Amino acid sequence: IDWSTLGFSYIRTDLRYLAHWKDGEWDAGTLTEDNQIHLAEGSTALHYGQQCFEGLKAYRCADGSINLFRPDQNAARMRMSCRRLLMPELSDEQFIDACLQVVRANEHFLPPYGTGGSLYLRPFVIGVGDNIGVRTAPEFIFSVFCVPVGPYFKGGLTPTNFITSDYDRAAPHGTGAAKVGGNYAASLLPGYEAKKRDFADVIYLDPATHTTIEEAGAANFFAITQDGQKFVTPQSPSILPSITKYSLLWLAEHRLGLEVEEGDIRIDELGKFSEAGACGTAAVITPIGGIQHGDDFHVFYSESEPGPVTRRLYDELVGIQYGDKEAPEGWIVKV
Amino acid sequence: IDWSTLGFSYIRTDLRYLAHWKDGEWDAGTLTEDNQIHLAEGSTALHYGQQCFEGLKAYRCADGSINLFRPDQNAARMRMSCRRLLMPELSDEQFIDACLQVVRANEHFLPPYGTGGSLYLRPFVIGVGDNIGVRTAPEFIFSVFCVPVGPYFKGGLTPTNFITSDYDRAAPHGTGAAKVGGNYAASLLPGYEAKKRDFADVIYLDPATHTTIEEAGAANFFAITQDGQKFVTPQSPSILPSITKYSLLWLAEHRLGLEVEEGDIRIDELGKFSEAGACGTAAVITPIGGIQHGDDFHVFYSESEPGPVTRRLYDELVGIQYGDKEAPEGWIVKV
Ligand SMILES: N[C@@H](CCC(=O)O)C(=O)O
Numbered sequence: 001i002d003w004s005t006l007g008f009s010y011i012r013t014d015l016r017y018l019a020h021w022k023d024g025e026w027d028a029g030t031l032t033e034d035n036q037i038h039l040a041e042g043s044t045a046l047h048y049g050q051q052c053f054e055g056l057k058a059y060r061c062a063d064g065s066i067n068l069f070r071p072d073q074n075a076a077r078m079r080m081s082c083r084r085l086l087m088p089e090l091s092d093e094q095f096i097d098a099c100l101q102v103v104r105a106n107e108h109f110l111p112p113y114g115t116g117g118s119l120y121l122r123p124f125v126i127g128v129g130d131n132i133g134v135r136t137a138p139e140f141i142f143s144v145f146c147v148p149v150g151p152y153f154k155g156g157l158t159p160t161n162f163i164t165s166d167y168d169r170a171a172p173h174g175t176g177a178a179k180v181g182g183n184y185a186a187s188l189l190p191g192y193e194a195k196k197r198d199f200a201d202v203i204y205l206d207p208a209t210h211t212t213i214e215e216a217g218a219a220n221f222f223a224i225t226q227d228g229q230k231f232v233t234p235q236s237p238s239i240l241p242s243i244t245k246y247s248l249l250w251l252a253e254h255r256l257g258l259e260v261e262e263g264d265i266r267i268d269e270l271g272k273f274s275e276a277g278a279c280g281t282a283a284v285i286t287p288i289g290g291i292q293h294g295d296d297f298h299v300f301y302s303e304s305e306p307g308p309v310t311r312r313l314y315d316e317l318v319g320i321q322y323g324d325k326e327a328p329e330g331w332i333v334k335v
Numbered sequence: 336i337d338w339s340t341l342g343f344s345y346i347r348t349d350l351r352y353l354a355h356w357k358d359g360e361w362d363a364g365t366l367t368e369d370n371q372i373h374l375a376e377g378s379t380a381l382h383y384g385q386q387c388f389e390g391l392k393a394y395r396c397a398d399g400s401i402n403l404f405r406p407d408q409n410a411a412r413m414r415m416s417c418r419r420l421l422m423p424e425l426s427d428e429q430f431i432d433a434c435l436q437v438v439r440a441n442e443h444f445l446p447p448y449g450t451g452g453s454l455y456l457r458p459f460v461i462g463v464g465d466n467i468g469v470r471t472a473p474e475f476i477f478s479v480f481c482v483p484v485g486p487y488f489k490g491g492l493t494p495t496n497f498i499t500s501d502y503d504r505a506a507p508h509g510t511g512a513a514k515v516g517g518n519y520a521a522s523l524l525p526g527y528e529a530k531k532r533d534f535a536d537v538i539y540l541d542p543a544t545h546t547t548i549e550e551a552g553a554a555n556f557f558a559i560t561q562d563g564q565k566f567v568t569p570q571s572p573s574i575l576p577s578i579t580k581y582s583l584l585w586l587a588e589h590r591l592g593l594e595v596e597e598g599d600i601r602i603d604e605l606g607k608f609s610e611a612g613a614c615g616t617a618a619v620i621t622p623i624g625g626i627q628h629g630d631d632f633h634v635f636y637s638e639s640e641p642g643p644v645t646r647r648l649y650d651e652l653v654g655i656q657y658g659d660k661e662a663p664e665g666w667i668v669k670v
């Protein structure tokens with residue numbers, strides 16, 4: 001309950017949502033206190049990476065109300081991840097309702113206003129049931145559990161450095177556009193090496209030729225030109241469609257009145273941007289001080305201070321989530 | 336118990352091996368009857384594909400003895416898979432001892448000589464314990480269960496067809512050289528699309544350019560030149576180092592008097608080979624009738640009969656496994 005020192009680690013909450021799929025259909029689902037998953041030793045989730053997940057947060061507002069941020073988008077994306085791995089899909093209704101149930105049943109774990117914390121929801125689908133050869137599972141499990149997470153920046157927006165790697169987290173036409181475990185497994189080694197070099201994480205280029213930027217490992221990448229007029233973010237069929245990224249893209253155009261561009265960002269022309277950063281649910285905009293690519297270390301704005309436009313986007317997107325700023329129609333759902 | 340109708344599907348055997356890793360080391364491991372894995376809802380094996388596995392067989396010889404085929408090779412390979420995903424390694428000692436324990440305790444499930452069946456072993460390692468962020472698991476489980484099996488892709492040197500795909504199962508610098516779940520997860524959709532078109536599976540091409548053959552996603556690929564004097568197989572950092580492939584590589588040279596080469600095999604020069612096949616533990620050389628690439632279906636030898644060199648490699652490989660032919664030194668561990 002010490003909201004203050006709360007970080008991003010697992011803490012067992014009271015109830016989690018658990019649903020089962022078998023013989024063509026999902027059951028109604030239920031809340032359980034267990035927290036332990038039980039599955040066949042041959043489950044495809046354990047042998048053939050047939051698994052996918054999502055990540056969203058619930059925030060308590062100053063007025064005491066509770067906000068769930070764009071749950072519909074997570075529903076949509078996990079449906080696409082399920083399709084990619086041949087797993088049954090969940091409707092917005094069942095997905096949203098499961099999140100609502102977990103939040104409500106675990107309301108006492110939602111960090112109060114004042115503490116920059118939040119209640120992190122982890123919905124996921126895994127292939128289960130007896131099996132041995134590579135194929136889609138005969139049964140599946142959909143579960144949603146939550147964990148309270150304290151502020152990500154215990155000191156305020158602070159930039160960190162990323163480094164490029166020869167390793168690929170995804171193939172040109174692989175599963176990089178879906179939020180599946182395999183992409184993350186592949187990121188373990190390079191991520192470890194980056195951190196062993198004192199870097200927060202690595203910035204993956206692009207599978208085919210390692211010339212343009214893809215992602216940072218746990219977040220999408222965005223950069224702002226030198227003239228602070230345009231917001232640019234990579235467009236690739238191998239990067240995860242970050243909900244935070246598309247949110248900022250909208251905010252940048254209708255809130256900050258900036259130019260928006262979904263295109264390529266070559267690692268050779270970083271000087272074209274005055275600042276850059278990583279965006280994701282957990283990090284919620286991580287200012288990027290500098291990027292190490294080979295021999296040189298390229299700093300965009302500051303290695304200790306966040307860029308001006310980055311602050312705007314951040315404070316903006318954050319205000320909406322916590323209900324301090326006016327939320328765009330459709331976004332945010334009251335619990 | 337009907338050995339003759341055995342295919343490649345899960346059948347619950349009596350006992351499986353289970354070992355736990357925690358606080359820096361593996362326990363001795365034990366035998367259990369369970370067959371259901373119990374793990375934390377946030378286990379990395381479920382969310383971040385931190386999992387790897389092996390596949391090898393035990394065989395009943397005519398003289399009554401039992402052969403375990405090159406288990407040392409599987410142990411070494413699983414060490415490489417583990418290393419790639421930052422999972423703790425298992426020594427040959429514990430790995431081989433685990434399979435021996437499983438074979439001995441489930442000997443009554445070993446298909447008798449005369450039935451081309453075998454006892455398939457499935458060793459695997461998964462990251463477990465409470466967790467939420469992308470990182471290596473705090474604990475791990477190592478387990479080995481067995482399943483009596485027959486043919487994977489038909490039986491008795493009957494050729495099957497394969498088809499090219501735009502999809503990639505692995506990246507140029509990803510986890511393609513390791514036996515990890517993410518690779519198979521990626522192959523699910525394309526593998527399904529192939530089976531719908533009546534093909535056995537997809538034969539993948541290099542991720543970066545799609546110009547050379549990689550492997551089938553469940554087997555390596557090999558071909559015999561038109562003059563029938565040379566055995567050719569692809570050399571790539573993104574394909575699995577198949578034990579069956581290396582075995583065939585050895586047999587081809589030192590037993591069949593063939594020339595051997597590991598190199599590029601362009602998909603546009605299939606006419607350079609009189610025969611082609613897919614090899615693996617489950618596959619045990621599956622003759623390739625033809626390969627569909629775009630609108631072109633290419634038959635190397637026959638869509639109904641195996642080539643003569645393929646037949647020789649198969650008889651030598653299978654003869655060794657079942658104890659009918661002298662085994663090369665080091666290959667074969669009597670259970
Ligand atoms: N899937 C990421 C979270 C992404 C986010 O914070 O939006 C993780 O488990 O670390």
Ligand SMILES: N[C@@H](CCC(=O)O)C(=O)O
Binds near residue numbers: 132389390614616
């Ligand atoms: N490990 C593969 C089997 C490989 C083989 O058939 O040799 C699978 O589970 O599909």
